[PDB]
Amino acid sequence: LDRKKLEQLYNRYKDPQDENKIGIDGIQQFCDDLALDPASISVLIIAWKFRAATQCEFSKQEFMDGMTELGCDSIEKLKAQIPKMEQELKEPGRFKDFYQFTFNFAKNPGQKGLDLEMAIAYWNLVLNGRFKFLDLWNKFLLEHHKRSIPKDTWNLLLDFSTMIADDMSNYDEEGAWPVLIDDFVEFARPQI
Numbered sequence: 001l002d003r004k005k006l007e008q009l010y011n012r013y014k015d016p017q018d019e020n021k022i023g024i025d026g027i028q029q030f031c032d033d034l035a036l037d038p039a040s041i042s043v044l045i046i047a048w049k050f051r052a053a054t055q056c057e058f059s060k061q062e063f064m065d066g067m068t069e070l071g072c073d074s075i076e077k078l079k080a081q082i083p084k085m086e087q088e089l090k091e092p093g094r095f096k097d098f099y100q101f102t103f104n105f106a107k108n109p110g111q112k113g114l115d116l117e118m119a120i121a122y123w124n125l126v127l128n129g130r131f132k133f134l135d136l137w138n139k140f141l142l143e144h145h146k147r148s149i150p151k152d153t154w155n156l157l158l159d160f161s162t163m164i165a166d167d168m169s170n171y172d173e174e175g176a177w178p179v180l181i182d183d184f185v186e187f188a189r190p191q192i
């Protein structure tokens, strides 16, 4: 890996007002160079591989360490990696890691939980086509005005989505389910 080539590539994205950070324009540019829409799951997958702390933020350390471990000193080398990252998420567990990372990436730094409509946005993206009851779930949350989602409720929603049946017949009340998922089963059962 040519470090000089990687340092100049970083210079293309860095904030004109802060050398140690990539700004909103630099994040947009990086997506454009990767031929990616900024609302694509592939942008979230890249954030996951670069292990970015929070959304709308990208540091020098994250970019440099990310590209080094991937062995990319160019955009074309990184674009060649995107189908390899998508393939790796076919593995449950790699997807569990990615899904759980999404909570920490989306929430505000300093805050322990994720705001409801922010969690719904990301659920719509990451649980797209892999949670039958997503429509009812969002409806239930927006209706019973739950302000924020706790880490364990977000995390156990994946366990719920992979274990639950179409009729919810295999759901166990005595199971280690958070009150929100448990209340959702009470609300949803008459509707299916």
Ligand SMILES: CCC(=O)N[C@@H](Cc1nc2ccc(C(C)C)cc2s1)C(=O)N[C@H](CNC(=O)CCN1CCOCC1)C1CCCCC1
Pocket: 027, 030, 038, 039, 040, 041, 043, 044, 046, 047, 048, 050, 052, 054, 055, 056, 057, 058, 121, 122, 125
């Ligand atoms: C789907 C991609 C994604 O998460 N996009 C984020 C913005 C990004 N931040 C980073 C940071 C680093 C990197 C590196 C390349 C690794 C990439 C990105 S893309 C977003 O707009 N996320 C929105 C929600 N956010 C918002 O609506 C704005 C949130 N505010 C911004 C100001 O500070 C407080 C939080 C999405 C839109 C798409 C569907 C899901 C909800």
